[PDB]
């Protein structure tokens, strides 16, 4: 009975080799006071044809500026300093099984069902460690309550 | 007890690189007044060996002319302008893990079970975002009630 | 328990003889992300004293630009092209039983109870076919959930 | 579960003073093999401002050519020759309470719910006795099963 | 299981200003020995545009010749001399809200359901007091058991 | 509740002595997408007054061109090559007990009740082996669901 | 308790680019009067390293000579002419994700459990559309009742 | 109710071709007296694009120095000398389906749920047999009770 709206926000990010990098998935700012219930994210990263992109999808309050200081580099393990600060709700890994120099274009889709919502003060993040310079076009349809 | 007929319509489409492009799946026009209950679509796209084809299968009334204005480009997210206009019932993604310059020929099959039918005034669409020029030969066996 | 607000929007329209003409009833734009639950519309059309105003109140997604291409002229029948596109929830007819040249001022009121709401992506319309140039002052108190 | 379609057919008829005149309400001929379940007819007759239009809505097989030989003139009574031939399912009367010489434009609407359908071999008729030359624009949305 | 027949008898009567005037509704005489169960009468009186026609529908044995001596003039009250002689089963009133000198044509319809029949020895009457010279075309479909 | 239609198709066939000959019973082609539920066939063969006409009524998919290669000559036995291809649902035999040279005119009627319908892709056949040149006028009222 | 025998029949077929081609899976002919209950087929097609082999496994009576006239080319959709003639019981698709010019050797295995058997008059087919010249070595262990 | 802590320890190991090599997964030594309940390990081995890494995850007391003397070389089978000494709780295999000389970077993730804990005297090991020189960056989030 709550008035739901499924808004779509995209986020383009060209990121370097070992950069653990996170993007907040949230409505476009013109909707404040929301409450994210479901997220359908589909990030289609163009990447080098031998490497991998290990992604995590984490609910946390207190928005994280530095990413390497909260997630470990070669695969996204939540460090114990931000252990209970950061709650993992999504995982995954996109490996490029392609050719020598023809860069692949692989996508991960994930339909996260957030239990008891994520408000505008909390932050739903998608963080990723790649192994080459990738060209993520990460967009997401959030299912907010406003 | 309703008189069912499983008709087969094919649709060839050579489409360019970032073209979000949709085809209506429907009987051949000689059958008006139908009611699509099940669709078995099998699109065998010949495509470049590094790219992907992200497809959506959407039930909507009010036939969509412009596709980029209703679905986002790099993966098919239903924009909030056409949010409740367009109902997603099928998803998927076909990635080309092949060679440098030998173009692959990959197919997606999908047996959509449409709840409470899709009449001739509604429109069942299959829309797809590719990442290179693909040669889709999308055909489909619909299971109409006439 | 949902925070309700009853906002009032007016819409003045002087429309010609056989013009099937529709106005969207919606909040004033400063409230996006609403959900219309009840509408009390009261349109007081000043009209010529021999004619009639046949009105329909229709819930539809996909906002209709051309009105004659979706509703028939002499009384508002939903054409079969937009058959399941357009859902009728209100009807009525205001006839002018007056004098030779003294133009009457007659009003229709309608308290539509919209089942399961009408969001900001759907469009609640009031469409009307008149038979002379009328001077509708159609205002409406919507009962949105924001 | 039967595939329903709501088609709209209009019928313009300018008819003279005491002409008992009937129009078959049926789909447009391009749909044969139908089965009419519901009819929403709305006839907006422009008429002289002192007279009346007494209409009947009758289900009958065996399509009636001569109308005065089956219905009585000053109000539509089914004559005993066609007594069980013709089944009344709708009645009504539109009186013009207007001015001396300013012709009114009055409409009757009727949502007939036909029990157990009306097939294409039966004929649903709307017959009317007027008392002046009227300009009926009788249209109707039938709810056929094909 | 009784053999029913719905016969139609019309009765034209041009009657003067304050004439309380009654017509027997009955089959055409070629059917004796009937038993009237239902009557659908529809009298379309053309009348002067300021006056009224107050009608009563009365079951009585002993056919009434003089009408003013059994019903009062300005509205049809059954006088106490013929109090239990005359049983009222239908009432009504047709008022002419029209113009100065353009005579209206207004009709009353009444579907009387006679309890336990009216035989050919009883008399079902429709009596009316007008207030100007009217041009009643009173016809009726009776539902006799023969 | 399915819209039924009882259409009548006739088929004239003058066939020779030992010709096992079959006619498809089906609607006239203007109705595609049907579903035959009941068939009332009545074939009135004029025949020589000493011979017999042994007929079979068979439901089969895959329309049979050659008849002797599926049914045996002197009485219609379904050969084992088309054993499960052809399902017998009607039998019979019309013998001519007449005169030396006065050719009789004998008819067989059969009201086949097809279980779970026969669609337009299946074929209901009536096949017959005669013993002289007969003049069959085989007509049939099918009871299709369209 | 029925005497079962699991016989093995192989079928070598080198077939061209867009050839929809079908092989009957059946015992070797020395066993007539069988009843196929289970089939374990394993076809190891050597094929070009970019293409696909879309196969269908279909139970039908009336053995099909022409394959393109019953199945559509780019993916095996059963055409509506042979709609109820041909019953699909197995599907699948073998894609070659290999190298430029080193031809792969990929196999599909399928253990079809045929409900209520397939006799020697019916025909169990495996039909396949390839996209290059393939070298199928399709063999199958059928589980007949004789 | 036991005080849980999820600590993250990484272990980099560049290991040669047929080296069965094991790493103890354990907290960093500053936490003694722990009790490992859950382990989320994610090892992202960069490896040659034709080979495989077969890994085992084994709970054992008595820390193993020599690895080839407890696990067999070409796939990790627990030898019968250390049969009940070593308890397997995790398995898996990472194959490199890539290119000629472009080394892939593939990861295995495993969320081991250790029944009744693993204390600091026991040793949870992850052992792996590769087939080329790999560059494992094996890190792990253990879920200890201190």
Author numbering:
A (entry chain A), B (entry chain A), C (entry chain A), D (entry chain A), E (entry chain A), F (entry chain A), ...: 27 to 172
Paper text:
Nanoviruses are plant multipartite viruses with a genome composed of six to eight circular single-stranded DNA segments. Segment S encodes the capsid protein (CP) that assembles into virus particles, which encapsidate individually single DNA segments. The distinct genome segments are encapsidated individually in icosahedral particles that measure ≈18 nm in diameter. Here, we address this question by reporting a structural characterisation of the FBNSV particles at quasi-atomic resolution (3.2 Å) by cryogenic-electron-microscopy (cryo-EM) single-particle analysis.
Image processing of the best resolved 3D classes enabled us to compute a 3D map of the FBNSV electron scattering density—with imposed icosahedral symmetry—(Electron Microscopy Data Bank entry EMD-10097) from 5,156 non-binned (1.21 Å/pixel) selected particles at an average resolution of 3.2 Å. The highly positively-charged N-terminal stretch (residues 1 to 26) of the CP, which is predicted to be dynamically flexible and likely buried within the genetic material at the interior of the viral particles, is not visible in the reconstructed density and thus not included in the deposited atomic model. The CP fold is a typical wedge-shaped jelly-roll domain—the most prevalent fold among viral CPs —composed by two packed, four-stranded, anti-parallel β-sheets (named BIDG and CHEF according to classic labelling of jelly-roll β-strands using letters B through I). Each jelly-roll subunit is oriented so that the lateral sides of two β-strands (F and G) face the capsid interior and the closest fivefold axis, while the two strands (B and C) on the opposite side of the jelly-roll contribute to the outer surface of the capsid. The CP subunits interact with each other most extensively at the interfaces generated by the icosahedral fivefold symmetry axes (subunit-subunit interface area: 950 Å2), where the BIDG sheet of each subunit is tightly packed against part of the CHEF sheet and the intervening EF connection of an adjacent subunit. Fewer interactions are observed at the twofold interfaces (interface area: 393 Å2). These involve loops at the base of the wedge, including the two serines (residues 87 and 88) at the beginning of the EF connection. The fewest contacts between subunits are found at the threefold interfaces (interface area: 301 Å2) and involve the first visible residues of the N-terminal stretch, which appear to emerge from the capsid interior, the adjacent C-terminal stretch, which points towards the capsid interior, and two loops at the base of the jelly-roll wedge. Though less resolved (>4.5 Å) than the density of the surrounding protein layer, the residual genome density is comparably strong in the neighbourhoods of the CP-CP fivefold interfaces, where a putative aromatic base—sandwiched between the BIDG and CHEF sheets of neighbouring CP subunits—protrudes towards the main-chain atoms of residues 102 to 104 of the EF connection.
